[PDB]
Scaffold this active site. Sequence first.
Site, short mmCIF file in Angstrom:
data_model
loop_
_atom_site.label_atom_id
_atom_site.label_comp_id
_atom_site.label_asym_id
_atom_site.label_seq_id
_atom_site.Cartn_x
_atom_site.Cartn_y
_atom_site.Cartn_z
N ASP B 25 57.55 25.38 12.49
CA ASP B 25 58.39 24.64 11.56
C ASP B 25 57.52 23.70 10.72
O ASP B 25 57.26 22.56 11.11
CB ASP B 25 59.46 23.88 12.35
CG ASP B 25 60.48 23.20 11.46
OD1 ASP B 25 60.34 23.25 10.22
OD2 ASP B 25 61.44 22.63 12.02
N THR B 26 57.08 24.18 9.55
CA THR B 26 56.22 23.36 8.70
C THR B 26 56.96 22.16 8.11
O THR B 26 56.31 21.21 7.66
CB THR B 26 55.63 24.20 7.57
OG1 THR B 26 56.69 24.81 6.81
CG2 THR B 26 54.71 25.27 8.12
N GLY B 27 58.29 22.17 8.12
CA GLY B 27 59.07 21.04 7.66
C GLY B 27 59.29 19.95 8.68
O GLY B 27 59.93 18.94 8.37
#
Lengths: 99, 99
Positions: B25-27
């Site tokens: 999850d890069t966010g």
Amino acid sequence: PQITLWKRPLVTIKIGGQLKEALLDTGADDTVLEEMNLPGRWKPKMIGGIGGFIKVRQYDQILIEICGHKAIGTVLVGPTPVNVIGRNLLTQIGCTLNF
Amino acid sequence: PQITLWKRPLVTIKIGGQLKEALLDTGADDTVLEEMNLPGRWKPKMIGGIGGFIKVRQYDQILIEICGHKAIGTVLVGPTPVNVIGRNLLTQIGCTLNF
Ligand SMILES: CC[C@H](C)CN(C[C@@H](O)[C@H](Cc1ccccc1)NC(=O)O[C@H]1CO[C@H]2OCC[C@H]21)S(=O)(=O)c1ccc2ncsc2c1
């Protein structure tokens, strides 16, 4: 380009003739953008995450440019604390995770 | 490996001697895992997502292997909708975004 993750992967996008900042978010199924008065019809929707759900407006077939990479697809508009580009559009610009 | 985003980037992780599925999850700034038992001390903390804030237990300097790559860092445990691997650990395994 290649983006490291030391900081938030923020990039400029163009949607509805407006420039905004948004996260390239591999954890987001859909694209969720801050409140904006897009024209056209829409359908209500609720999306869940950490903390619970928020109500959003689903617009379909929206033109959006991400770092000069054009895409078109569903965009959700609502009281989100951050603009997130989801997998529905990340796939259209050829974005991958690499390690 | 190179991971496309046509599907959720779900991978197997090993933490506390137990295997689990988790979302790259890069966010997410931080790593948040669903309720579980982890040894050692922890501190109560708050973390906010798209829908508000939840209560989590913060475990520091936890060993966690992500898709065969080892990392040691902070792990938050609480009522998250899904196990998410955040940037604090994605950087450790050398993860970048590429388009
Ligand atoms: C269910 C899996 C995750 C939680 C989903 N989220 C994307 C995630 O990247 C989120 C995107 C996000 C980023 C910042 C504020 C609000 C949401 N980040 C996040 O919650 O991270 C938290 C953990 O680390 C901390 O750093 C950021 C907040 C904390 S999300 O914003 O709630 C989201 C986006 C599109 C979508 N389409 C259907 S459901 C759905 C949910």
